[PDB]
Design a protein around this ligand. Sequence first.
Ligand SMILES: Cc1cc2nc3c(=O)[nH]c(=O)nc-3n(C[C@H](O)[C@H](O)[C@H](O)COP(=O)(O)OP(=O)(O)OC[C@H]3O[C@@H](n4cnc5c(N)ncnc54)[C@H](O)[C@@H]3O)c2cc1C
Ligand SMILES: Nc1ncnc2c1ncn2[C@@H]1O[C@H](COP(=O)(O)O)[C@@H](O)[C@H]1O
Lengths: 312, 252
Amino acid sequence: QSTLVIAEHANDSLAPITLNTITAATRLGGEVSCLVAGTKCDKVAQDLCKVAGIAKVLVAQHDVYKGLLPEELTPLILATQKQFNYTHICAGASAFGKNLLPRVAAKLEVAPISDIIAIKSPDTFVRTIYAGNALCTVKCDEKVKVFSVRGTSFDAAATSGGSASSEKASSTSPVEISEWLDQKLTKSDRPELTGAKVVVSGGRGLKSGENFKLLYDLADQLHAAVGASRAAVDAGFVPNDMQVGQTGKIVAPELYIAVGISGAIQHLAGMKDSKTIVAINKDPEAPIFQVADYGIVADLFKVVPEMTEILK
Amino acid sequence: LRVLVAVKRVIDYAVKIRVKPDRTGVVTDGVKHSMNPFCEIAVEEAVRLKEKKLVKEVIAVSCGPAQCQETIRTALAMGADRGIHVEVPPAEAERLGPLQVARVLAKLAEKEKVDLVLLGKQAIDDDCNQTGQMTAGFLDWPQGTFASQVTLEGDKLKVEREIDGGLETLRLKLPAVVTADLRLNEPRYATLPNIMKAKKKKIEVIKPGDLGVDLTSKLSVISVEDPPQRTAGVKVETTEDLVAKLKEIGRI
Ligand SMILES: Cc1cc2nc3c(=O)[nH]c(=O)nc-3n(C[C@H](O)[C@H](O)[C@H](O)COP(=O)(O)OP(=O)(O)OC[C@H]3O[C@@H](n4cnc5c(N)ncnc54)[C@H](O)[C@@H]3O)c2cc1C
Ligand SMILES: Nc1ncnc2c1ncn2[C@@H]1O[C@H](COP(=O)(O)O)[C@@H](O)[C@H]1O
């Protein structure tokens, strides 16, 4: 029983979701290896070597990994698999993990498991279906278990206490059927939505993007990340990467504050595991009140500013 | 180009699902079903390409019981040229997952000689987000997942994708596989006359076996259960009370 974690990272910085995935991997009870691929892996590989729980770190550094295209990483991964014969291959259920892992599974001819929230044994996992409204326990009898891990369901592994050997990896010939052209990232100073301890989200109730400013001010006092619903995105108030829910990001902060959000099934799918949920909505019949630990039926344009002041 | 569009029949997104008391699945009998929202967007995109005269034919395909034929009809009424139903008996359909569907789509892609396969990025029931990626892997074609923008530039495809911290643009060599994200477009509504003409367009029915696809699965659902329920909350009359409440419980 050997586990290969595919490390996610960018700009010599390791994606936090990889730390949660390492914890899930150690729960399997086998030796854990970590594959770091990309154009620049030297810093990250060193950091991963200190991460508690890792035994081996494989480094595949090459210009072909520009953009971390699945078509280029897959052959690398199959090579590593042939050579070390892992029984489990995983990655965090992020856009990167979801994009890559099902492609690898097809090449291995196995059925992958998506977004697991719990491990009962090396071959039995728990995941949610129907927008998180049902828990599905699955028994996987595949020769190789390929799965992605829900970051919020596992604690992050300690970034120290680990001893691991870095080793150069089985590097392949370029496929070149796809090419990375460019990107447009949403530059923000607020803390990342997925790792935030407090999250403040707004929906259609904010009427305009200028009004979202109120949420930013409130968020500041709480050092919170700001999220949104589809309505706010489609209306153009905020960018789509801020969307919380089934089609967006799944968060489980200590405190989630939903402002001007009805609480539709698809939104609850991404925040109903928050420790404490607060709802600010003028409609007393809004579904959000059914899951809110604390709720106030009032105008957000009145309550939000007041809360910011009380917080000052 | 020839496009292959995969559509799945699922329980309507607005429906409050109920887990069977025997914990073998969710109630489906007498429950409203409809085309998976992500699939609708894939179909709309295929049709738009045809309307821009960049695509010649659009084939809609669905795997599952006889009821899937209504889903295909819908795709036809939206503008798909012809449909293909890969029939699977209700009992066996319960075990149908991304792996089997991907294998079926891969065989159909080469059989039909399509240049592009469009899927939704995930089915709202299984929430797997796997079938498109697996199809591409089986076909050894490039993939453009979570696409919110698609452009045919001769023999290549320009795709802008939704990623965690923003957007990303790739260029893929045709043939390729693309999975649609909600942001790609707004699906049109099929009008009565189109729903009528859709009844004339014929659906080809085939079995997985006829394609050489084995439905064997090494995944087994042990159980399906209701998630743990949350303790009903309290309503605070003033903002001051709200903050007071949060402070005493150590959230603030
Ligand atoms: C396949 C699929 C996936 C989806 N994925 C997502 C997803 O990831 N995330 C997501 O959020 N949605 C998602 N949706 C959309 C979801 O179905 C709902 O359309 C959406 O969440 C509605 O957003 P809302 O609550 O902002 O708007 P509404 O439902 O319109 O609610 C607005 C709320 O604001 C309250 N309000 C208005 N003015 C005030 C005021 N002045 N003070 C206080 N309260 C006020 C109103 O009473 C109302 O409750 C998805 C849909 C589909 C079909
Ligand atoms: N039974 C099916 N028939 C046709 N297409 C399917 C089927 N299951 C999944 N798909 C396609 O694959 C996409 C992603 O589904 P999934 O991988 O199950 O999340 C769906 O949006 C459909 O385009």
